[PDB]
């Protein structure tokens, strides 16, 4: 996921 985005920012993971």
């Amino acid at each position, epitope marked *: *996921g*985005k*920012g*993971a």
Partner: antibody, heavy 115, light 111 residues
Framework: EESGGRLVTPGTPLTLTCTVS????????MNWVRQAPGKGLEWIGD?????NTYYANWAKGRFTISKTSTTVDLKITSPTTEDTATYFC???????????????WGQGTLVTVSS | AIKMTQTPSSVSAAVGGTVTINCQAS??????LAWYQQKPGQPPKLLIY???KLASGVSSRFKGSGSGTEYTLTISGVQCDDAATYYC????????????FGGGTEVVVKG
């Protein structure tokens, strides 16, 4: 032969074709952005590589974004005089930590909705 | 809804000076943030991606910084070629967005 502008009478649907090719990468969207006279950039929506489309809340129900082969369209479903604007398409990309931005932009189309 | 807020609305800088313009997000966008330069009659040009990285061919006079909700763009050694309107944009989500772009900051260069 592309003029760079359009004249559409209110209520007649207008379809714009993006000159940037569709996403090759999975984490990539094609986007449509308007700029009304004297105003800032207003994101309209995007289309994902799984086919899903998103619209800015004001834009919900006023546009449809679609893909045909490797070409992305924007359909203004019932134009009003408030849709007079320059329209751009733009492509972005990202991974799990970096947003790579809208790196590729098409040229603007100068749309006027008028009777 | 993630609101993007740019301040100031307009700023002036002498040639050779330094300006800093700000971009605030209403929620943490995890540095999924891009900056653009637009001159009249042109499409916007990507300047900075992932909050702090120089897009292809962009002058290193441009510096992006920040994290969480607060981001900045700094132009060092301002040149007349930098006169433009600058926009920030969140690339964190496409859902429940009123505008992904901030409202823009006009940069006037004093020659």
């Amino acid at each position: 032969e592309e003029s760079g502008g359009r004249l559409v009478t209110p209520g007649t649907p207008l379809t714009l074709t993006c000159t940037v090719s569709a996403c090759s990468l999975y984490h990539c969207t094609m986007n449509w952005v308007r700029q009304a006279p004297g105003k800032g950039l207003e994101w309209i929506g995007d289309i994902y590589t799984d086919g899903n489309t998103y619209y800015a809340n004001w834009a919900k129900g006023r546009f449809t974004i679609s893909k045909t082969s490797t070409t992305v369209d924007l359909k203004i479903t019932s134009p009003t005089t408030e849709d007079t604007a320059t329209y751009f398409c733009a492509r972005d990309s990202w991974d799990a930590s970096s947003y790579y931005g809208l790196d590729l932009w098409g040229q603007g189309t100068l749309v006027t909705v008028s009777s | 809804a993630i609101k993007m807020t740019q301040t100031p609305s307009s700023v002036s800088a002498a040639v050779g000076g330094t300006v800093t313009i700000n971009c605030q997000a209403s929620e943490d966008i995890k540095r999924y943030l891009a900056w653009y330069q637009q001159k009249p009659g042109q499409p916007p040009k990507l300047l900075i991606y992932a909050a702090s990285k120089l897009a292809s061919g962009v002058s290193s006079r441009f510096k992006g910084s920040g994290s969480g909700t607060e981001y900045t763009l700094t132009i060092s050694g301002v040149q007349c070629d930098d006169a433009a309107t600058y926009y920030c944009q969140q690339g964190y989500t496409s859902s429940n967005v009123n505008n992904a772009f901030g409202g823009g900051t006009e940069v006037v260069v004093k020659g």
